[PDB]
Design a protein around this ligand. Structure first.
Ligand SMILES: Nc1ncnc2c1ncn2[C@@H]1O[C@H](COP(=O)(O)OP(=O)(O)O)[C@@H](O)[C@H]1O
Ligand SMILES: Nc1ncnc2c1ncn2[C@@H]1O[C@H](COP(=O)(O)OP(=O)(O)O)[C@@H](O)[C@H]1O
Ligand SMILES: Nc1ncnc2c1ncn2[C@@H]1O[C@H](COP(=O)(O)OP(=O)(O)O)[C@@H](O)[C@H]1O
Ligand SMILES: Nc1ncnc2c1ncn2[C@@H]1O[C@H](COP(=O)(O)OP(=O)(O)O)[C@@H](O)[C@H]1O
Lengths: 120, 439, 459, 438, 449
């Protein structure tokens, strides 16, 4: 390939002289006008607004923003650094008086909090 | 803004005397159709009470008789208190999933789970961080109005390091999670640098107290809880789609858990409406699923509209009324809309002319009302905005008769277009592909 | 945190909410009106034997057909079976429409639902120590190893639950888990005796005030005994064992982890997995540690199955571990969905029809309709005058059972918006005019849609 | 420049009153249809109306696609014009309604103005100044400048392999940076190194430029649905990792509307609703038209221009239903319909002259008359195709202009479909050795 | 050992003059067709013409498939013979014209000499050296590995590239292992423990292997047989490097892809260079499309392009159909079920139905091949069924009758055993009469129609 195509702005995503679109579009579509940035999510976090569920899915605004922007390999590495603590609660919070206790910030994480595997 | 003037923008509610459900002849944008509007108001009372599960209501009638207008009016007067999922029947034909799977989703979008929550959240601009790498440390953080020093635990210092927190960052700490979010930088720090990273955002500093605590009400559909549980970060699929055919033992387990949340008062269930517009585009396999789906304790009320006469049911070769199986119609009560009278047309044209802010002369509205009687409501409605643009080329203040007349000659109504096709039989391409390009 | 809703917790009502059972004597004879049923006495008696067949667990892959016109109570009878069996017996209802997955061949979908309908009950003992960690304390060994700075012979852990305190004299090797799990004093943990390891549940909320900011979720102290030994009963369908084997869940590698982050498509599981599962399941049944619970697969609108589905069910029903399959159909003489030149009764292929016990459901007499109206009214909580019961039942006879039942909720509203708690003929006469039936609406299509040029129906 | 079929059409050729000139901007005739298209232009430029539908209807070769392209140019480049054929809707990758929905949003534009603050120079210094903030010194032939760097753009500069003596480009507002090379003042550090030596920038080291940037609502959808570009490196494996189109949910499109409105209120972004043109609209099936009923009723929706050349024809996907234009009658009620009529002999002569002088072909007037006869008797579209061959034939005969002999020679070399149909008839007498396969 | 339908066919049975011996190499008759198939064999061995088509046209059971199998044996194992049915073209993963091209390129062989340039030895020492990446975020990285390899004859210390060290990590190498490092790929293979550590007292079944003889560094010459399709596939879904794409390509599900003509023309140039370098020779072969009537109008249209390719193989089609409808072209009927257009490209070898005495002779060849002894009355009786019913039918009786004979203790099949086989095992037409006679009545005992 000629460097005009492969290096000097024949690739649309890579910014440089002779690709003035790419640097703008990178900032605005991934940060400014991006629904997943924490400043945008926090405006919609309530009521019947579109991120209302976020309160209960066991993830932070920072983590929601990370998962929207990193690819499935990078996310899978981050997932290595995590613990099946909702599965351990199934071992521990067990009696009727424990009332199947679940962290309210993990309330919608239903199938993780109860499945046969952890008990087995 | 983004909300430009659309076809149903004038419909602001159902227009009924709420204590008695009697439709007022013209109010909230709806005109006429009192029998249909009263039946729609009774359906609202079933919806708002929520005790009745899985009624199906079909709104039937000729084209341009308010079947969508009435369903939009119900959405406007039901209010965001209750889910109102609007499904075009064409959308059920997914490649990502089964037809019945796509319907199972649309049914569950229409049932809300409502939770009321106290969240305790600290947000402020970071003044400084101190660490005793002798672990412990102190965070100094401010609003415009308050400032404090906080003792940080070691795990908090680790998380602060991982988030690369520095002075001038706006951060939030969720006390329940114990998790930091870097929200951005204060506008006061805009002068720190000559070049900024792509990911950086400026904010106003937080304001009021630091450790705000708020009563929040959350309304979440059963479909959202499905998609969240479908896979490890399924909440991403809420936006991209990409759910697949969510396995039923997930849905059964979610339904069981939501029943506990109601029993314990942790949540309330908010049944809503699914409106399936142009339902005759569903096929025989769809209707068979919907038969069983309506018979469920967590079914919404389903409303649907059709304009078909006796017509072939899709997925078979016999005809039936409305295009629907008689087996299905046995579960449905039917609301019929009717054609409008000339005086009801005159009002609807006035309502539309107001929304588009067009000043019709009385004679323009008269002529335009005749056109709507002769050529259909939508056609006359389309000539309102057209005549405005033609009058503006005259720099005229009001739409005159001549502007409606010129709009009429330039734009053919359907009946005049169908005539034009017949007179052009051999120059247009027929159903057998033959055409003659010669003069 | 969550604000509890304290006011009311009443049930919704749906088309079958009145059906409570088959309504049969101890002799199995049907009572003319019981458990919400009216009539169908012969069909209820036959379904009563079906319940006894299922509950006896003797037989595999028997087929039943419910046959009869629309509205004749076929799905009501299926729901009554599910209630007679109770929630311990698996009950997997589908329509024939649900088989046409886009992800897998429709015979896999049919076999999935087929093995959802088979339950397995496994009894095991759970045996764990639990608490917040009150203390961790090494004991030096009496014979320390040469060249090593410390030799530890025991690692004492104090565990506190809400109900007691215990000093666990653990084997020293648990140091591995404590380091890797980062167990502190005050963290809630369990130790499982089948491994001797430990897992960290979290930090006890007794310490939630240690700092102004900490990245901890705080968890309550366990409200059980400090030592929890008990038997636990696990209920799984054999489909759960299929998926647990074909899509293993716990994998630590990059490919497993990318897997669990992507759309989890179902896959056309092999007969040799299912057969290998069956053979090991049968081992544990013979050991007596598991018991098989054959349930019911109910296929509604079974006329929507095509001939490829039916020819597979032939094979499936012959397998030794199979549910009872209940079909329901209403299609008279009809074309088989996949064989456009074969017409048969019920729309069921004659080859397959020979397998089924067939139960007919007949139409309802006018007096049965009237009894159902009252049962349905008292289920929706509507109060009627007796003249209103008669007028409603007249629509049931003249038009449809379903139609007349559906007017009760509209009429209830029109009554109360006139200040009346009891619905009367004047309200029924308004419900029936706001809400047409299929036939009166079809008459409008014939009359107003007599032409289509404008203001006519699209046809 | 190249010459496509419509390159002579510059615009609708309307007067200030909106009356069509009998011949202007490359059109001949269609005055009624051009005037009606002029009103559609006003509807588009008066930003206030969503979801108005238009139909162009008339025979093949009567100028429907010329009229849609004339609208596009009267509308200028600012406003989105999104042309598709009804045939493009049949993706194998998402349902037809998603393909229509994506094209609805490609027609709605959002204009932003950035002041791009560009620094480009040889790196003179890279000194840390924080516990991490740098000072970068940049040099050009005209001076030096030092920039305090945000810790994150510093990492961007560090992921590029920038060192002292390199030439770099920086967008200090967007946070983009590029290594252009190593400055050729260092070209003799060694006699061989695998390095790209470039001259020091001769201009000002800092440049400020006004850029008007256009995106569409669909670009926002795509960007919010999935990690894009260099964020999604694993996409290189293909198979499951390919950036497939997905069935974007309304929940996503509603969040994008909300976030976009925020930036409109702040005046950062300017909304620009445009046109979706669906040519060959009769190729849409009954399920597509059903969705277009709903889709045109959202309050953000472009103006949709259909074209059809069908008479009474079966609706695709609904064999029982026949209607005019091949458009189901339910949907035809919504549309403003413009008829396009057949051209007359003298109008054809005029279109021929316009096409000749657009292709640069010079004709004798006898050649004009002979070509125009073929438009009357065969097809306008067949006239115009003959001009380019006849120009070649003329020049190899050494002539400076096309004449009757070159037209007559071109006619014989290049048959129309009517004469070739006569050949198919006379030769297709049998499946024998010389027969066409029937 | 196992005997199939064609186990007696050994070749075309031709003279050096190219004339069919009336019974040779397992054949009886088909002499004109065997002679034509001889000329096809010689067209292939000449390896000079691309893209010539042959139709074996003739009724079912007339030996069309036997002849194609005989061609394969006359060509021998050097030449690619690629047999398919038309039913195999209908992949779900890729378009039907893709599997045509794959099979066209499986029919073209290449023999190539390859130099493996390789290191071997017992690993004596192994020591990593590291880079202090400041701001990559992934932490430190190993910059090289130093490894000591010892053979019987000599020793080296290698400073390996990081991507070759990753290969050693994948191979779980330790000090004292014997390893192989192919520098072509950068792949590493662990051969075993050195025999110097040979001890019973390890729980795992280690391969204790002797120290490599010769130098640590070697060059091996290997002659490889590949097809063009193997090269296409290798380069479409790469797996040979130690880069990250190759690494992950070994973990993802195998998947066919619609390999572009750009890749195929590029691989022609690669192979042309091996030819010009003298390391390779082209071995163009033959694609046999059995059941070619099961192709469709899109396949046949594609062959009109594909057979024009200047390296296309020889294509042999078999069809058993008279005037029949072309699939996917339901209005068009033509002889053989082949479009008239594409039929003009082929040389048609018609095959003919057998005479009673040829059938009798086939029965003996086939009986000898299955290893079963018949009386002449038995051979005559079976031959009668070959005449009256079908050759295939009469040959199917030999195996049943042998068992039935052995069951009575007689080792030789006689007429009573065939007489029993006839009644246990019906032909298609006796079964079709049972259908029709019973099909007079429905009810419980009717056949389902
Ligand atoms: N009763 C009504 N009051 C006000 N506007 C109406 C009424 N009925 C129809 N319209 C308007 O006329 C147009 C066509 O009616 P609509 O209900 O959308 O058609 P359909 O009857 O085919 O569903 C829409 O713009 C709609 O808002
Ligand atoms: N014997 C009965 N007693 C009480 N209610 C019945 C009876 N049969 C039917 N119903 C009710 O009438 C309606 C029609 O019955 P359903 O089971 O839906 O008919 P089918 O399944 O045959 O279409 C349902 O609402 C059902 O609950
Ligand atoms: N009124 C006109 N004046 C000049 N050129 C025209 C006119 N109408 C059509 N053309 C040209 O003639 C050709 C045929 O018209 P086109 O618009 O493609 O037909 P269709 O209506 O079938 O799409 C095109 O090259 C177009 O540019
Ligand atoms: N000339 C022959 N000599 C010996 N065996 C033959 C001959 N022709 C056919 N057969 C055998 O008879 C059977 C039918 O021939 P086959 O090639 O399968 O027919 P088709 O043309 O249908 O492929 C095969 O077992 C084959 O080996």
């Amino acid at each position: 390939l000629p460097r005009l195509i492969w290096c000097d702005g024949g690739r649309l995503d890579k910014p440089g002289p002779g690709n003035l679109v790419a640097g703008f579009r990178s900032k605005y579509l991934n940060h400014m006008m991006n629904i997943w940035t924490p400043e945008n999510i926090r405006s919609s976090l309530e009521g019947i607004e579109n991120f209302t569920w976020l309160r209960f899915v066991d993830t932070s605004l920072q983590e929601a923003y990370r998962a929207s922007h990193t690819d499935v390999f990078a996310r899978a590495v981050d997932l290595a650094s995590k613990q099946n603590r909702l599965g351990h609660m199934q071992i521990v919070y067990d009696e009727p008086e424990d009332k199947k206790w679940t962290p309210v910030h993990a309330l919608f994480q239903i199938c993780e909090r109860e499945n046969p595997k952890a008990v087995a | 803004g983004l909300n430009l003037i659309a076809a149903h923008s004038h419909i602001r509610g159902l227009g009924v005397d709420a204590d008695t459900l009697e439709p007022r002849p013209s109010s909230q944008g709806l005109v006429g159709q009192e029998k249909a509007r009263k039946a729609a108001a009774v359906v609202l009372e079933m919806i708002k009470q929520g005790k009745i599960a899985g009624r199906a209501v079909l709104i039937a009638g000729p084209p341009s008789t308010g079947k969508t207008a009435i369903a939009m009016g119900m959405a406007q007067s039901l209010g965001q208190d209750v889910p109102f999922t609007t499904l075009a029947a064409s959308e059920i034909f997914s490649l990502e999933m089964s037809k019945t799977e796509a319907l199972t989703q649309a049914f569950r979008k229409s049932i809300g789970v409502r939770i009321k929550e106290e969240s305790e959240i600290m947000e402020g601009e970071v003044v400084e961080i101190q660490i005793d790498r002798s672990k412990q440390g102190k965070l100094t953080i401010k609003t415009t109005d308050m400032e404090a020093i906080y003792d940080m635990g070691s795990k908090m210092i680790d998380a602060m390091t991982k988030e690369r927190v520095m002075a001038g960052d706006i951060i939030s700490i969720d006390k329940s999670s114990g998790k930091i979010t870097k929200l951005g930088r204060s506008y006061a720090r805009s002068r720190d640098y000559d070049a900024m990273g792509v990911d950086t955002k400026f904010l106003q500093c937080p304001e009021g107290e630091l450790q705000k605590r708020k009563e929040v009400v959350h309304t979440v559909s059963l479909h959202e809880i499905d998609v969240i549980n479908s896979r490890t970060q399924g909440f991403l699929a809420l936006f991209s789609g990409d759910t697949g055919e969510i396995r039923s033992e997930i849905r059964d387990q979610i339904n069981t858990k939501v029943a506990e949340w109601k029993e314990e008062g942790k949540a309330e269930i908010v049944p809503g409406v699914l409106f399936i517009d142009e339902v005759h585009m569903l096929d025989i396999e769809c209707f068979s699923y919907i038969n069983r789906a309506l018979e469920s304790d967590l079914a919404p009320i389903v409303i649907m509209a059709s304009n078909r006469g006796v017509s072939r049911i899709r997925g078979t070769d016999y005809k039936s009324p409305h295009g629907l199986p008689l087996d299905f119609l046995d579960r449905v009560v039917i609301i019929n809309t009717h054609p409008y009278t000339p005086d009801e047309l005159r009002q609807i044209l006035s309502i539309r002319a107001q929304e588009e802010e067009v000043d019709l002369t009385p004679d323009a509205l008269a002529l335009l009302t005749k056109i709507g009687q002769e050529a259909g409501l939508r056609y006359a409605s389309n000539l309102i905005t057209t005549s405005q643009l033609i009058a503006a080329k005259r720099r005229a203040k009001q739409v005159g008769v001549e502007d409606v007349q010129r709009s009429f000659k330039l734009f053919y109504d359907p009946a005049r277009s169908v005539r034009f096709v017949q007179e052009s039989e051999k120059r247009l391409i027929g159903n057998d592909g033959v055409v003659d390009f010669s003069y | 945190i969550s604000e509890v809703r304290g006011n009311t917790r009443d049930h919704r009502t749906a088309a079958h909410t009145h059906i409570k059972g088959l309504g049969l004597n101890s002799s199995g004879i049907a009572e003319k009106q019981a458990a919400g049923f009216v009539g169908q006495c012969a069909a209820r008696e036959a379904c009563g034997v079906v319940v006894d067949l299922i509950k006896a667990h003797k037989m595999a892959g028997r087929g039943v057909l419910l046959a009869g016109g629309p509205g004749t109570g076929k799905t009501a009878l299926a729901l009554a079976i599910s209630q007679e069996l109770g929630t311990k017996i698996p009950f997997c209802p589908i329509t024939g429409s649900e088989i046409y997955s886009t992800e897998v061949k429709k015979t896999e979908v049919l076999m999935e639902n087929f093995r959802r309908a088979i339950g397995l009950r496994v009894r095991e003992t759970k045996d764990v120590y639990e608490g917040e960690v009150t203390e961790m304390t090494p004991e030096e060994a009496e014979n320390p190893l040469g060249g090593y700075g410390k030799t530890i012979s025991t690692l004492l852990i104090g565990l506190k639950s809400a109900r007691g305190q215990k000093k666990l004299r653990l084997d020293p090797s648990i140091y591995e888990a404590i380091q890797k799990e980062r167990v502190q004093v005050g963290d809630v943990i369990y130790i499982e005796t089948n491994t001797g390891a430990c897992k960290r549940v979290g930090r006890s909320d007794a310490y939630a005030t240690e700092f102004d900011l900490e990245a901890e979720e705080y968890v309550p102290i366990p409200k059980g005994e400090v030592h929890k030994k008990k038997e636990i009963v696990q209920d799984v369908t054999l489909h759960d064992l299929d998926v647990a084997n074909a899509r293993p869940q716990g994998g630590q590698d990059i490919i497993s982890m990318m897997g669990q982050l992507m759309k989890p498509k179902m896959t056309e599981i092999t007969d040799k997995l299912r057969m290998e599962i069956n053979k090991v399941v049968q081992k544990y049944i013979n050991q007596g540690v598991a018991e098989l619970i054959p349930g019911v697969l109910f296929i509604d609108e079974a006329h929507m199955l095509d001939i490829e589905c039916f020819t597979y069910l032939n094979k499936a029903l012959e397998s030794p571990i199979a549910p009872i399959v209940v079909l329901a159909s209403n299609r008279g003489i009809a074309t088989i969905r996949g064989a456009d030149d074969l017409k048969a009764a019920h729309g069921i292929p004659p080859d397959f029809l020979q397998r089924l016990l067939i139960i007919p459901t007949h139409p309802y007499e006018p007096d049965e309709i009237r009894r159902i109206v009252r049962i349905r009214a008292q289920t929706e909580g509507v109060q009627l005058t007796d003249a209103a019961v008669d007028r409603v039942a007249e629509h049931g006879v003249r038009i449809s059972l379903r139609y007349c039942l559906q007017l009760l909720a509209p009429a209830s509203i029109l009554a109360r918006v006139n200040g009346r708690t009891q619905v009367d003929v004047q309200d029924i006469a308004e419900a029936e005019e706001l809400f047409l039936d299929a036939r009166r609406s079809a008459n409008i299509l014939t009359s107003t849609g007599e032409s289509g040029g404008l203001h006519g129906f699209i046809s």
